[PDB]
């Protein structure tokens, strides 16, 4: 038992102790909704067999148009990380971030200042794109992909005529080797798991929190309570839930840590920088 009490205050006290040196963040769609990117969990014209087919690789490869139509509708006017992203930046700068495992493809962790080595982009990224042909794999940048999306021309390889897709992991695709490589090391020794903006419904990402040592405390910051968390039973000993929006949860935790001013300054200067671009 490493937490004195199963509360946000208990987690904050623990984070301040010398015991808490290494923190893994596990994040999903809920950390980016306030950045104007909706939770993926006008397409009627395509008569999809079921709504989920939009993100399945087998369906996508033969009928890519519905996906790219959705991409146009939901493409943000700007890429601006949230308070929650900047909380993770604070963890990084304070030497507390072992890794951020993300389910998101929006690049906002990168923009917030998390480096390549800080991240496991478990579901890939929208930032880069590639031809699907293994013998070709021609790369295309975001500007090229965005132009195809907005002009409603299906991305096609200029060399081999094959489909070009963003470097996202569609349902039914393998996760990157980096995911499994980092998982095998990071969860052997970690002091805290910070689970934010995910209901842990997607595998094998959902399985990650079970990989931590049994003594590792785990804080959930999410709108609602499949990872194997136990908050409420008489056997509860290490898991804490804070229910609401991720920005507000991170602000509450930062205030308890005495980081409220530091966080708000960081958000405001970084937002100013992005707006001045």
């Amino acid at each position: 038992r490493l937490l004195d009490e199963l509360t946000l205050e208990g987690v904050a006290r623990y984070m301040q102790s010398e015991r808490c040196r290494r923190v893994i963040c596990l994040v999903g769609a809920g950390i980016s909704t306030s950045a104007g990117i909706p939770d993926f969990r006008n397409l009627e014209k395509y008569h999809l067999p079921y709504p989920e087919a939009i993100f399945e690789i087998s369906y996508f490869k033969k009928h890519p148009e519905p996906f790219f139509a959705l991409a146009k509708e939901l493409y943000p006017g700007q890429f601006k990380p949230t308070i929650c992203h900047y909380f993770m930046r604070l963890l990084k700068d304070k030497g507390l971030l072992l890794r951020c495992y993300t389910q998101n493809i929006d690049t906002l962790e990168r923009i917030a200042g998390l480096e390549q080595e800080d991240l496991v982009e478990a579901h890939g990224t929208f930032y880069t794109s590639h031809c699907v042909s293994a013998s070709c794999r021609h790369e295309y940048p975001l500007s090229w992909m965005k132009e195809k999306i907005f002009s409603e021309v299906t991305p096609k390889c200029e060399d081999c005529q094959s489909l070009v897709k963003p470097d996202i992991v569609f349902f039914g695709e393998s996760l990157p080797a980096r995911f499994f490589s980092c998982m095998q090391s990071d969860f052997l020794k970690v002091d805290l798991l910070l689970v934010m903006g995910t209901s842990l419904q997607v595998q094998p990402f959902a399985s990650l929190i079970s990989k931590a040592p049994l003594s590792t405390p785990r804080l959930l910051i999410n709108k609602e309570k499949g990872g194997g968390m136990d908050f409420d039973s008489k056997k509860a000993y290490r898991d804490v839930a804070w229910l609401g929006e991720c920005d507000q949860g991170c602000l509450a935790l930062a205030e308890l840590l005495g980081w409220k001013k530091e966080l708000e300054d960081l958000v405001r200067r970084e937002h100013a920088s992005i707006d001045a671009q």
Partner: peptide, 7 residues
């Protein structure tokens, strides 16, 4: 390598 499932 293991695949993305559960959507």
């Amino acid at each position: 390598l293991p695949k993305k499932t559960g959507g």
